[PDB]
Structure 1
Amino acid sequence: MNFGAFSINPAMMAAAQAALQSSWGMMGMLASRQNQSGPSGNNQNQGNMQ
């Protein structure tokens, strides 16, 4: 009797795919973990006087 008639239009699956847009792709000032190109941070203690 189900000649493809009881096929349900996706919504939860549809929203899940859209939720990815909020999952990642965040703004830089919101994600405090910023990357640096090279050892410019200087974590060495030798040469560090405070």
Structure 2
Amino acid sequence: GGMNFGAFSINPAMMAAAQAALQSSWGMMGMLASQQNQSG
């Protein structure tokens, strides 16, 4: 899971949204779980 669920159909002829998203995005450096679980 990157961050996007559900199979959605799209046809970026521009990748136009990607342009704005690239700037809209924000870092600082991560966030992720160091240890991965199996049970649940």
TM-score band, normalised by shorter chain = under 0.3
Runs of 4+ in 1 over 3 A off after TM superposition: 1-12, 25-34, 45-48
Of structures 1 and 2, the larger Rg is shown by: 1
Whole-angstrom CA distance in 2 between matches of 1:2 and 1:46: 21
Q: State the superposition RMSD in angstroms.
A: 16.2
Whole-angstrom CA distance in 1 between matches of 2:26 and 2:20: 11
Offset of residue 32 of structure 1: 19
Identity of aligned residues (%): 92
Higher relative contact order structure (alpha carbons within 8 Å, sequence separation ≥ 6): 1
Structure 1 runs not aligned, ≥5 long: 35-44
Whole-angstrom CA distance in 1 between matches of 2:23 and 2:4: 35
